[PDB]
Amino acid sequence: AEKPKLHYFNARGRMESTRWLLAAAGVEFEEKFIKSAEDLDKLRNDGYLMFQQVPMVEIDGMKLVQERAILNYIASKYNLYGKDIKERALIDMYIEGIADLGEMILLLPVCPPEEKDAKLALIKEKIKNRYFPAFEKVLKSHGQDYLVGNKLSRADIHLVELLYYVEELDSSLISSFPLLKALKTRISNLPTVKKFLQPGSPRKPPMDEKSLE
């Protein structure tokens, strides 16, 4: 079929988790970067963005917008969404927690400077006291190499992606969570993920001081 085509800025933002998931699935995809106001205006004007926003992914004849819609479809299509309704429920619970933490970190830069040191401190306390304990407990409960169904799912991918973001922020935060560290290592050595973390992949760098929109 058509290779999926990802429309977004040349940046992580709200498209990165899709890059991770497709790459983890071994799926060949192409990207078309939005470099100007004019590029975005053209996609909007031509009718390809349901709510006038990117990310947008062309896949299987659809022009899919909304990160969560894109990710749900990709996960099902490539058998990364568990095997039944109840496994999808655990997966969804897990990944919605990951997205709540992720959203805090995503938005930390565009915070006002006088709130920004306090928001960081609250993120670190939630990481230590709420989120990392919750995922460590799941991994402890069954002792298996994957979060759900003893099989690779989107939840392992989304989690390990966030573990890399948390490491960028503060490498000490994972230190009391040995099962989270071990997950990071195993997932990162899966052939597809190993290739994605290697240079020359679609994986994107963190945003730097030169972030002018």
Added chain:
Amino acid sequence: AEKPKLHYFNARGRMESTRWLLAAAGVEFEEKFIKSAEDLDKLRNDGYLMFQQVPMVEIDGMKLVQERAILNYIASKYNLYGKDIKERALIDMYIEGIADLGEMILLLPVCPPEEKDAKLALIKEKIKNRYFPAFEKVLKSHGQDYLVGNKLSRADIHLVELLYYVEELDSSLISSFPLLKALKTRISNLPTVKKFLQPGSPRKPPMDEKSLEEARKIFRF
């Protein structure tokens, strides 16, 4: 056939869309209202809340948190998530747009007072120029009574819920969108939804300033 048990404050918040969905599906549920910071602490200390937050719904042996996990489960179980993964992709795309607008409206009462006039104006502009046109376009595309697959789905239920909240904000916003008005009327006349909209159901009122400070007390913010 144990009834779902919904753990939340006596208010709409992040549990109201689940009330709508369950009611639309003809499913009877019970609610256990959190009325103090002590009640919430107890849920947490009893290990009921994976991430120390509500909403939480006890359903089929699970203690499900996260509004989207709860809704996704109920929708799939009651055949309101479309017939296949491509129909689910359309449903997800539509309901995530609805969620984005619903989020702006939900947070309006805690908007910094100094930002509230500008924010209210921006939401009304997004309704008239972004969201309402997108759904009017989908409805005009197929001319069918439902958003996806010519069949009732969660997308119809969540959209119509939102149309009621937008009417509360400003009743004029829908006036240029005939097909949305028509969808509102059709969905509102389905028996389960008509029962839910009538006086006496578990449907919750708008948050007033009282309910808001009560939330501040319990949530500790």
